[PDB]
Amino acid sequence: KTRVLVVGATGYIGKRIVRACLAEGHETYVLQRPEIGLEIEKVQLFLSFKKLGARIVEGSFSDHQSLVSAVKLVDVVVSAMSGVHFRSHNILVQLKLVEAIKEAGNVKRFLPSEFGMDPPRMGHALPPGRETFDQKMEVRQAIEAAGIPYTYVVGACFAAYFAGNLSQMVTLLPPKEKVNIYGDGNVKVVFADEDDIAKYTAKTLNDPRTLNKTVNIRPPDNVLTQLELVQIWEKLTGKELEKTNIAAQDFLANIEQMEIPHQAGIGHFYHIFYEGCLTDHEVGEDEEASSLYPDVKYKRMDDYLRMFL
Amino acid sequence: KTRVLVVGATGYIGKRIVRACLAEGHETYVLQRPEIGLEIEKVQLFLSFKKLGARIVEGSFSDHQSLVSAVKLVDVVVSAMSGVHFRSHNILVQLKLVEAIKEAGNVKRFLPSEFGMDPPRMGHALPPGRETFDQKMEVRQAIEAAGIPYTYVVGACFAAYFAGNLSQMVTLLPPKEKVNIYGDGNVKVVFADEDDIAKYTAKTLNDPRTLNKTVNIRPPDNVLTQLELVQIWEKLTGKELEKTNIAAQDFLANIEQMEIPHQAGIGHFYHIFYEGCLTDHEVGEDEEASSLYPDVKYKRMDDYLRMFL
Ligand SMILES: NC(=O)C1=CN([C@@H]2O[C@H](COP(=O)(O)OP(=O)(O)OC[C@H]3O[C@@H](n4cnc5c(N)ncnc54)[C@H](OP(=O)(O)O)[C@@H]3O)[C@@H](O)[C@H]2O)C=CC1
Numbered sequence: 371k372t373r374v375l376v377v378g379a380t381g382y383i384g385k386r387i388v389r390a391c392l393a394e395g396h397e398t399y400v401l402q403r404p405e406i407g408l409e410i411e412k413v414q415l416f417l418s419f420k421k422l423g424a425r426i427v428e429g430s431f432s433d434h435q436s437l438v439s440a441v442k443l444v445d446v447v448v449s450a451m452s453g454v455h456f457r458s459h460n461i462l463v464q465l466k467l468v469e470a471i472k473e474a475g476n477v478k479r480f481l482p483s484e485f486g487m488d489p490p491r492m493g494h495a496l497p498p499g500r501e502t503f504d505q506k507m508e509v510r511q512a513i514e515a516a517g518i519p520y521t522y523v524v525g526a527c528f529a530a531y532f533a534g535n536l537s538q539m540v541t542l543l544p545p546k547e548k549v550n551i552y553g554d555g556n557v558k559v560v561f562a563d564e565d566d567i568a569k570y571t572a573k574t575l576n577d578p579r580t581l582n583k584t585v586n587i588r589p590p591d592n593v594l595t596q597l598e599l600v601q602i603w604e605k606l607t608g609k610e611l612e613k614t615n616i617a618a619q620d621f622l623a624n625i626e627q628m629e630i631p632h633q634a635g636i637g638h639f640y641h642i643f644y645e646g647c648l649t650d651h652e653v654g655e656d657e658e659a660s661s662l663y664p665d666v667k668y669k670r671m672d673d674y675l676r677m678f679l
Numbered sequence: 680k681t682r683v684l685v686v687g688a689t690g691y692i693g694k695r696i697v698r699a700c701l702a703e704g705h706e707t708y709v710l711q712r713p714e715i716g717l718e719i720e721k722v723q724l725f726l727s728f729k730k731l732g733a734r735i736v737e738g739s740f741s742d743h744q745s746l747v748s749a750v751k752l753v754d755v756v757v758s759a760m761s762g763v764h765f766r767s768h769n770i771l772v773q774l775k776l777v778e779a780i781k782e783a784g785n786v787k788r789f790l791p792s793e794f795g796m797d798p799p800r801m802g803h804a805l806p807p808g809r810e811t812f813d814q815k816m817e818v819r820q821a822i823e824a825a826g827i828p829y830t831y832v833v834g835a836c837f838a839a840y841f842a843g844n845l846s847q848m849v850t851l852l853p854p855k856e857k858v859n860i861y862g863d864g865n866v867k868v869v870f871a872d873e874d875d876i877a878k879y880t881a882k883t884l885n886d887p888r889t890l891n892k893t894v895n896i897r898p899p900d901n902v903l904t905q906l907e908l909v910q911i912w913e914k915l916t917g918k919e920l921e922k923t924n925i926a927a928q929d930f931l932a933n934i935e936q937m938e939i940p941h942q943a944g945i946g947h948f949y950h951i952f953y954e955g956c957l958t959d960h961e962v963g964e965d966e967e968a969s970s971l972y973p974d975v976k977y978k979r980m981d982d983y984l985r986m987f988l
């Protein structure tokens with residue numbers, strides 16, 4: 371049994387990773403930080419993990435030796451540290467975890483908080499959205515400068531943020547009548563249910579094939595244009611939506627006058643839906659999750675969207 | 680089948696009431712308000728309610744007719760509106776719901792957002808804590824002035840906020856080595872698991888016996904002093920805690936200088952643990968939930984605390 375510590379265990383993707391690790395059979399440890407306080411939903415998530423068999427490990431990012439003691443207990447560390455401007459964007463806090471892993475010396479593999487666009491490919495990214503990738507790159511550089519073996523999990527839009535809303539911004543539900551189409555809407559995007567992302571992570575974290583590699587989550591039936599996604603919804607509903615195409619220059623108009631988190635979102639949507647950054651390069655079968663783990667029957671977006679009917 | 684609308688469906692107790700209504704067999708409707716935006720946990724809670732058979736009703740407290748339309752769909756309305764200063768304290772927003780219920784005219788019973796200390800008994804309360812009971816009394820006045828049939832569910836500390844922490848403030852986990860005891864620790868307090876509170880609510884809302892009544896949740900095995908509660912934990916863990924007794928005067932010292940939500944918390948804990956407001960009066964079996972619904976095998980506090988080992 372691989373021993374796994376999840377740091378960020380009550381996070382959006384973090385809690386899914388905890389559950390998927392348990393379902394995979396890993397001996398699953400979860401870091402419980404003392405600053406929780408009155409955050410009742412966090413406390414009760416930890417209780418729910420214990421009932422599923424997770425082991426609680428107490429530690430604080432402000433207490434270096436507590437982090438050393440935590441990672442000494444496991445073979446693999448997975449980090450799901452926050453990385454979204456409108457939530458919190460604390461990627462660089464992981465540098466303390468890396469340093470603890472360095473001193474501990476026993477960790478066979480570290481999966482840092484990636485789970486999105488492939489940061490070394492985003493050097494051209496618009497600020498402040500670029501902060502996400504610069505910060506993940508600083509963490510990558512610290513990992514490699516510490517000699518820590520790694521797997522970087524990248525390449526898919528979380529279905530809840532990009533599919534269930536037909537990719538409309540500042541909402542998480544399909545629009546009732548009108549939808550904005552980015553450009554012509556024929557740029558391929560990668561979509562994945564976050565529980566599948568979690569299961570691929572649980573499967574890849576002790577896979578010799580992915581030691582010191584980037585693992586792409588690119589399930590082929592889930593590579594879709596925004597128009598193709600919208601047409602899935604239109605079939606499910608029996609109603610066509612009124613589509614308005616937004617040219618690039620109009621999408622980015624006056625971006626510098628927006629709130630920073632909205633600026634970051636616009637910049638990211640630009641790279642995904644206008645530049646096609648998730649599909650503008652190809653990846654081999656030996657570095658793509660759905661090929662590596664064909665037993666994962668990943669949820670297709672027609673099934674995903676049916677939840678919203 | 681009884682049709683129930685839950686308003687506050689994604690709340691802490693509200694989400695438990697939704698699930699309990701569904702388990703009880705009620706045709707369960709949930710109010711989904713339009714402003715959720717990027718609140719992904721709320722959105723996914725509603726999606727999880729659909730998966731259990733709940734029916735989504737859209738409406739807004741700023742759209743009076745939407746509230747009228749929502750309550751026309753059902754026989755019973757249950758409100759779980761917020762009522763905690765450090766979360767949010769929007770009890771009086773229910774006044775708009777009472778108006779809509781009054782105009783609708785079909786509602787057989789309204790359970791407003793009570794679920795705590797018995798407001799009519801708290802006329803002496805310390806402000807700002809007293810705001811909670813003043814505002815709940817204002818809602819009771821509106822309900823009764825409108826002739827709306829009601830049930831008021833009162834009388835127990837939620838186990839998460841009072842039992843799982845051995846009643847220590849500003850934490851939700853049992854303390855490691857030391858514990859503060861309020862006074863002599865010999866004042867009886869009522870504790871109940873929140874899932875039981877929800878199950879009692881789902882059973883009582885169409886029970887003729889509680890029509891136009893206050894129903895108390897006072898399960899006899901869960902009437903415990905703080906010292907009895909602590910001694911359960913010591914027995915479960917096999918370790919005595921170092922106890923510091925805090926006199927009433929020192930617990931309240933300098934209250935006026937603290938932040939308002941902490942002042943509220945201090946005032947409530949004072950009424951509960953020093954004045955014994957939950958046990959300083961008897962209630963008959965005909966108005967006590969565990970007697971009315973003896974098929975609820977309520978969770979005792981030793982089994983509750985066992986979750987924390
Ligand atoms: N479409 C996509 O591909 C998406 C990509 N992502 C990426 O997923 C990764 C995780 O993001 P997400 O799930 O939204 O994360 P969250 O916003 O849910 O935060 C995850 C965890 O970060 C921990 N955390 C936050 N701040 C601190 C801090 N100062 N110190 C210590 N711990 C902290 C917390 O851990 P604890 O549980 O211990 O409290 C928290 O639960 C990110 O890299 C993000 O960029 C995110 C959404 C979409």
Ligand SMILES: NC(=O)C1=CN([C@@H]2O[C@H](COP(=O)(O)OP(=O)(O)OC[C@H]3O[C@@H](n4cnc5c(N)ncnc54)[C@H](OP(=O)(O)O)[C@@H]3O)[C@@H](O)[C@H]2O)C=CC1
Nearest residue numbers: 687688689690691692760761762766769792794795836837
């Ligand atoms: N120990 C005890 O006995 C305890 C008693 N209570 C009492 O329980 C009741 C519910 O409290 P709790 O579960 O903590 O509540 P929450 O803080 O979880 O709030 C409940 C719901 O209130 C709705 N809400 C909040 N603000 C507004 C607003 N401006 N307009 C419309 N709706 C709003 C939201 O509904 P939506 O889902 O639509 O978003 C929210 O989910 C309170 O009366 C409280 O005093 C609570 C804790 C301990």
Ligand SMILES: COc1cc(C[C@H]2CO[C@H](c3ccc(O)c(OC)c3)[C@H]2CO)ccc1O
Nearest residue numbers: 454486487526527531538539540541635638
């Ligand atoms: C749905 O509306 C929004 C949705 C988001 C989603 C945010 C989701 O987490 C996304 C994300 C972060 C880092 C990534 O590498 C990524 O790759 C797909 C996605 C963010 C993209 O801006 C941001 C702003 C919005 O208005």
Ligand SMILES: COc1cc(C[C@H]2CO[C@H](c3ccc(O)c(OC)c3)[C@H]2CO)ccc1O
Nearest residue numbers: 763795796836840847848849850943944947
């Ligand atoms: C555990 O630490 C705390 C616990 C609480 C209780 C919060 C949530 O509601 C508890 C509560 C509220 C209203 C009530 O009528 C009630 O019990 C009857 C309990 C709140 C009491 O102040 C408050 C402050 C704290 O620091």
